[PDB]
Amino acid sequence: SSEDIRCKCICPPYRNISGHIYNQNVSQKDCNCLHVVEPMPVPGHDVEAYCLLCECRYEERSTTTIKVIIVIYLSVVGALLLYMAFLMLVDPRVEGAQQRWKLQVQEQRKTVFDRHKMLS
Amino acid sequence: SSEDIRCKCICPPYRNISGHIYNQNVSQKDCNCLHVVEPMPVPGHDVEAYCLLCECRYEERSTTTIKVIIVIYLSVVGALLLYMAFLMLVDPRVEGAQQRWKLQVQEQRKTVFDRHKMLS
Amino acid sequence: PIPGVGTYDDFHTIDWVREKCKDRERHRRINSKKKESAWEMTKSLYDAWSGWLVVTLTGLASGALAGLIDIAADWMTDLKEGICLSALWYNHEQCCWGSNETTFEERDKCPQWKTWAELIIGQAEGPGSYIMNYIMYIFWALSFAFLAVSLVKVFAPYACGSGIPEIKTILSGFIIRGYLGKWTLMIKTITLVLAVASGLSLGKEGPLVHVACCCGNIFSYLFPKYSTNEAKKREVLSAASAAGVSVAFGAPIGGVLFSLEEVSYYFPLKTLWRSFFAALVAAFVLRSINPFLVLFYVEYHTPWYLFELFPFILLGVFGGLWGAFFIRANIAWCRRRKSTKFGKYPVLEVIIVAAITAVIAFPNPYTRLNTSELIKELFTDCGPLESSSLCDYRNDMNGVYSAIWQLCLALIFKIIMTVFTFGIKVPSGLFIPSMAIGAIAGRIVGIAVEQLAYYHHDWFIFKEWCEVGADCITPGLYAMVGAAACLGGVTRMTVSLVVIVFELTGGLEYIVPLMAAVMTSKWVGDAFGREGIYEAHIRLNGYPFLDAKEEFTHTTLAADVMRPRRNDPPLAVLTQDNMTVDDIENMINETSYNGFPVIMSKESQRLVGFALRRDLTIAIESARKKQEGIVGSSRVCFAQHSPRPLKLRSILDMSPFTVTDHTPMEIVVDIFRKLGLRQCLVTHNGRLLGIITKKDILRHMAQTANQD
Amino acid sequence: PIPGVGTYDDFHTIDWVREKCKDRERHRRINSKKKESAWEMTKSLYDAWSGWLVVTLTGLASGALAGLIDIAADWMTDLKEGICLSALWYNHEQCCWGSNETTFEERDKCPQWKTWAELIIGQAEGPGSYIMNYIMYIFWALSFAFLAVSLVKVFAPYACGSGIPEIKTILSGFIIRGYLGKWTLMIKTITLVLAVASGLSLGKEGPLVHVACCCGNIFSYLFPKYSTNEAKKREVLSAASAAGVSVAFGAPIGGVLFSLEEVSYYFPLKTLWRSFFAALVAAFVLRSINPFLVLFYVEYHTPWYLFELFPFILLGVFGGLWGAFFIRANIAWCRRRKSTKFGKYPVLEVIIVAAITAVIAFPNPYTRLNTSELIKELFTDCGPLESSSLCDYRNDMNGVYSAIWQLCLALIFKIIMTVFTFGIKVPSGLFIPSMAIGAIAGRIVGIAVEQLAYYHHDWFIFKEWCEVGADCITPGLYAMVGAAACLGGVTRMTVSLVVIVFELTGGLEYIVPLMAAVMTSKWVGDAFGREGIYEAHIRLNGYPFLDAKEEFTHTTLAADVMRPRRNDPPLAVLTQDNMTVDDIENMINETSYNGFPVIMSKESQRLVGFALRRDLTIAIESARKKQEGIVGSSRVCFAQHSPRPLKLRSILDMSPFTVTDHTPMEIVVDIFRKLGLRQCLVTHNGRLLGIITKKDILRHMAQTANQD
Ligand SMILES: CC(C)CCC[C@@H](C)[C@H]1CC[C@H]2[C@@H]3CC=C4C[C@@H](O)CC[C@]4(C)[C@H]3CC[C@]12C
Ligand SMILES: CC(C)CCC[C@@H](C)[C@H]1CC[C@H]2[C@@H]3CC=C4C[C@@H](O)CC[C@]4(C)[C@H]3CC[C@]12C
Ligand SMILES: CC(C)CCC[C@@H](C)[C@H]1CC[C@H]2[C@@H]3CC=C4C[C@@H](O)CC[C@]4(C)[C@H]3CC[C@]12C
Ligand SMILES: CC(C)CCC[C@@H](C)[C@H]1CC[C@H]2[C@@H]3CC=C4C[C@@H](O)CC[C@]4(C)[C@H]3CC[C@]12C
Ligand SMILES: [Cl-]
Ligand SMILES: [Cl-]
Ligand SMILES: [Cl-]
Ligand SMILES: [Cl-]
């Protein structure tokens, strides 16, 4: 995808022309100083020297992975918040485990915050 | 020292001219394709291409360290051989430790070679 | 045996000898039935591969969760600064990743990313824009902290803290039910991201170990071998901790070394390779998700010089000096939370700490920047391609004073805030803050050294080692050394720390400096106390943890630690025969003893075995349910095979560890540590005289420490 | 106490509990006198830093000796090929180092270096020159082998072999006087170079550990803390072994891991950092001498692909398959040397083996090349700059058959010769031959894979993973994987091996393949036996080594291993009082028991303590010398304070370990392994019934193994 890939170089300040950045979406073989920089401020005799001074890198990112991870994390957080709200507002074999966990969390919450000292 | 340092470089076969080697004693700043290779078979337009194809390296070695290590090892080996010859030919607080070690070495020699079995 | 026998209550230590006995018995039973049927052969094959499968699953889960946590934290940390309207799911870097409006001065500047001032006020620059950015940063930090603390408290409040101290206690045999459960796993996974986003002075690297330790525990329920045996489960937990460290720092070797040196009380040989494989798998998973071969990659072209060791050692002196101080400070604060009234308001404390952190951090660019990103920036060298403010002075002549002042202010702020941040009721890591503090200190030291070398190149050391007017000094290496020194001083880890730093850097040329710095820090820390921060927190929480460092006095003998002593009445004893079930039940209910010795006769006091209270009650109840007529009148006989007497020889440990009263406690402690004994029976003239429990040893050591 | 008490005879195991007791007593004595005087404070400070100083000295000595050995071996290995008349101290590479007569085809061709044919015959080329080179190579190999074996036999017979098995036995508590002495150190240092020069199928990497283990031992005599305590000396020996591995492979982390996993029976936490520091110092010393940052540096531009794991696993299958075979072959040969008549002629055997090796190796270029140099060449990738014969086919089209045939012949020759070379009476290492064999196998596999990919790129796997007509497959990586697999199969080391290979390569991108290959090899080896080559040699030599793998049967009980048994008469016992010195001396002389239990009375059989035979005799003799009238008639009283009875309570272990007769040996073995006990006293009803010694456990395990 055009968003996944890019190729960008950064050139340090050479003589009069200060350092500059140039980015564009190309393949690895296209990613080079001459192709990426268009136009190039440096004069004819210093063109090659400018190419060595500058650095072009071709990078690829997995936007879909970040998409999916963020979406799933946000959904999990929202579900947790909704369940919490139900617990504090609505509530006042799966069900048995739920109530056993409720008692366990009550006891262990008493251990953690109320006292901070569950010494045994 | 002229022996300690060198700068040599190797060019792979380019077109008609086969790969070649060139070495000479220079400093790091002098060690480069253009300086090391004199004359360079490649034509004018391909000179720079030849320089990129070729690889030049500057190296330094410690001849004194090798000299000293070899000399000391050889002297130790010679002393050991002379002591062995004295033991097999001439012999038939330092001295006390010497005879104690002689008895100990007789023992361990019996153990390692004659039997190979010291099971305890 | 009776169902439920061999189990333990919550907050109890396991008997490693009994666990090994059970594991060997199960192995014998499984291998005996291999020839019976093909299905038995398949079951045996699955049992043999159970360890490999569980470590693989733990590594995969740890890698996936680490990648998800890292990505979510990176995305959320930038929500405070602004939002990418075009793609709400891209952070500042990703939103500006493919934009052509970037500039050399500002790499992450593009119209797609809009700061909150632009969203609401509509102006990117101006006093109003700065004020609104300040307020929105504070509000987002407070919201993240409040959500994290609320989620921790409501669902799985074991998720608070790094978890390394509790993991250390558990791997020594302690039992904490729910600490490594599914609820804790999920809640810690969410709250680590939330807290890292909030901007609090904490990290998600150390706490990730807990995450891993949870996953394996869950997976340990899919394999009977590791579900039924506590020692095997703890081996799996050690492998999980190694994998967690690996994903945290991308250091599988470093993770294995940390597991061996810090958290694993017992590390069998097989556990080494199992942990290494799990760590490698987890690192592979992280490398297949997060990248979108090293995290804190550095490029120091100049090789480190010998004289640079002297400044590095100085950093070590700092690394320990802060370390011990933190151990003296944080604990002093943490104890107060357990003694004063502000501990009764954890949510309010977290909110206030987040408010203070954000308020004092936003004005200073270094503090506002993420701690991991700050470490990244400090670890880089200065060059023509880079445009960091830290290097501005180098470009000016070659303001240094302004950069040094900002770095010092950030260092002071981080040092002050780490004391008040560690211990609060949210997932808090100590690796990232310590590394950031050490990196700032090392950057300052490297800047000073570079200034001295450039301005005073006439000095023989600089002139000989460094070419005049050359960038021989690399501040990034100094920052790395300072971070390593601070981490060593605060944690006291020596080899695992060095290997973790090297793997997280990828530079093998700087092993000797790091080590040296670490050594110095450790020694300096040991000058003010040999206990690390994790051990200090273990002691503060009062967990039953026994360490090799602790030792007893020479004069102390076993007779001085026996439970019966003088004031206490005679220790509970069970007769072999002529004893009713009612008497056993009454004794179980009356006394809280973990177990009871058994003697042939009351007068003889000739030892027979040891009956654990839990096993006793479970067996009695099961026999009552199964066999009618057990109404308490029926006698109980422990001897080898109308009333239908209950047989309790199966639940009896026929080989209880026995020591002499004249035996010094110097050897009793060694026996307890090496063999992991839960109790020993002190005898004299062949009869039972007393019982020394691990609780007694811990209580004596704690009393001696308190007297000091 | 009486001088000489607490010492042990040659070929005896140490009591770790008693060693720790002595160390703690000495620590108490030293710390008690700190306040007495300033000189006492300085002595205490020196004692505290004794460990650091000894590890530093051991690392420095190990690095210096490793550098010297490497340089001498490199210089001598080329003496067979020719001589540099201008500089007799330069090898072929150094002699041609600065020559301008070099050529691209021949890098080491220059008029300064003259082959023996040129020296004597006067012609560099021709059938006569080849014949003379053959004869001179054979003669030099024979001379080097004869000198090495003669030096080993005359001065230090313990210098033969790798020494890793004996080091493993020693670190478990065994005592071998003279094994780690100055004579052994010097003789092994010389003979390793001599043997490596001879061209025998052996290495100097593994044996270097012994060298290091010697140095520290010597340095342990400069510090009373480590000179008087055996456990502390063994900790220093573990650090020395780590440093030795580090210098051998330039892998300080790998050295520490090898020490922890292979040779160190007990590895305290402090030993980890001490060994790491010693290894780092030794590596620094080697880097400051030998170079004139990695030895087997590799450059695989193409990252390893997932499908390449499948060939790598195949190499693992080979690595184990050879490994086990070697363990079955070499041992079968070694046992023959201990049973047949050719073992009575070690010098002749060494000479014959060297003759065969040289004769069959000279014709084939790969075999003639040094094993380390062969591994170096195999680990390199093929490129335009290189001109190795292995890559000729690649340049021809892109003879492969000729190169593959030569590699296969070299592999077969090395495999056959390693079996007959390991175990001979010269310093022989197993790392280099195994790595060379695995490297040859991996090179062959990589060549085959490259040919398949190039000729059959239409296959979906190759086309998708590899670009058509691209050098994606790197034979050097395959050779590295094969070497790692073979080393793992022969040694069964898993994590230490992988880390050592990675450090010796410097490539962190290939950790996952190596590990996997190693795993496979190990498993394959475990399919044919779980005992490694070092453990196999330990068993063959019959050393008293106890391993965690060995276990007893469930039915076996302590009563089945007690020394008195039935046929044997009652075990020797000493009465507390009413006993003469003459009786004690007679009992000591008559019985070979390491120690004697003490009972209150003969009828009562109530235990009191344990008196070691050595301590008994030393105390009796010292008392006789010091105090007149001790002519044997005077009674000996062990009870706490005219005949002037001798007092022997000081030499008495007042807390001898006691177990019940019903206790299964399953727990006795665990106790012995964890606590390092030298003996246990099996009691019944509070009285003494028998004694179970570590010798008894070892004998029972050996008998059970023999029955199998
Ligand atoms: C606690 C965590 C998980 C909650 C994260 C939710 C964040 C991402 C949400 C909460 C409020 C949201 C904003 C609310 C309103 C608007 C205006 C709309 O025209 C564009 C999106 C924008 C600017 C949203 C961006 C995303 C946002 C900042
Ligand atoms: C066992 C080891 C230590 C012995 C090593 C000694 C070697 C290096 C010695 C032994 C015999 C020596 C050779 C004997 C004779 C000559 C002829 C002379 O005109 C030049 C040197 C030369 C060619 C010598 C070179 C060095 C030499 C090869
Ligand atoms: C029960 C537990 C242990 C299962 C956990 C499975 C995890 C580790 C699996 C599920 C989905 C997997 C991902 C699915 C797809 C891809 C894209 C590929 O180009 C690289 C691997 C990668 C990124 C996988 C990595 C591992 C992964 C995250
Ligand atoms: C008692 C024992 C431990 C002492 C051993 C000291 C050894 C390690 C010392 C003695 C002489 C030393 C060498 C002397 C000179 C140089 C040249 C210098 O440019 C690099 C270090 C180097 C190569 C030293 C390395 C360490 C060295 C070999
Ligand atoms: Cl962290
Ligand atoms: Cl942490
Ligand atoms: Cl070797
Ligand atoms: Cl070896």
Residue numbers in the entry:
A (entry chain D), B (entry chain B): 23 to 114, 156 to 183
C (entry chain C), D (entry chain A): 78 to 369, 374 to 479, 495 to 737, 745 to 811
What is the paper's account of this structure, in its own sentences?
Five members of the CLC family of Cl− channels and Cl−/H+ exchangers, ClC-3, ClC-4, ClC-5, ClC-6 and ClC-7, have critical roles in endosomes and lysosomes, catalyzing the exchange of two Cl− ions for one H+ ion2,10–12. We recently found that the ClC-3, ClC-4 and ClC-5 clade of endosomal CLC transporters requires the accessory β-subunit TMEM9, which we refer to as T9A or its closely related homolog TMEM9B (T9B) for proper activity in cells and animals. To resolve the mechanism by which T9A and T9B regulate the activity of ClC-3, ClC-4 and ClC-5, we determined structures of ClC-3 alone and in complex with T9A, finding that T9A occludes the Cl− ion pathway and that inhibition requires the endolysosomal signaling lipid phosphatidylinositol 3,5-bisphosphate (PtdIns(3,5)P2). Each ClC-3 protomer comprises a cytosolic N-terminal domain (NTD), a transmembrane domain (TMD) and a cytosolic domain (CD).
We identified a two-fold symmetric class in which the luminal domain (LD), TMD and CD of both T9A protomers are resolved, which we call ClC-3/T9A. To distinguish this fourth class from the structure of ClC-3 determined in the absence of T9A, we call this class ClC-3/noT9A. Because of its completeness, we focus our discussion primarily on ClC-3/T9A, which achieved a resolution of 2.9 Å with C2 symmetry imposed. In ClC-3/T9A, T9A wraps around ClC-3, interacting with the luminal, transmembrane and cytosolic faces of the ClC-3 TMD. The T9A LD interacts primarily with the ClC-3 helix B insertion, forming both polar and nonpolar interactions, including the embedding of F181 of ClC-3 into a hydrophobic groove on T9A and an extended π-stacking interaction between R28 and R83 of T9A with W174 of ClC-3. The single membrane-spanning helix of T9A, helix H3, extends along the periphery of the ClC-3 TMD, forming interactions with helices B, C, E and I of ClC-3. The T9A CD consists of the H4 helix that extends along the cytosolic face of the ClC-3 TMD and four residues at the extreme C terminus, which we define as the CTD. Whereas both entrances of the Cl− ion pathway are solvent accessible in the absence of T9A, the CDs of T9A constrict the cytosolic entrances to the Cl− pathway in ClC-3/T9A to a minimum radius of 0.9 Å, which is too narrow to accommodate a Cl− ion. We, therefore, assign ClC-3/T9A as an inhibited state, with the T9A CD forming the gate. In ClC-3/T9A, PtdIns(3,5)P2 interacts with both ClC-3 and the T9A CD. Thus, PtdIns(3,5)P2 appears to serve as a bridge between ClC-3 and the T9A CD, raising the possibility that PtdIns(3,5)P2 influences the equilibrium between the bound and unbound states of the T9A CD to regulate ClC-3 activity.
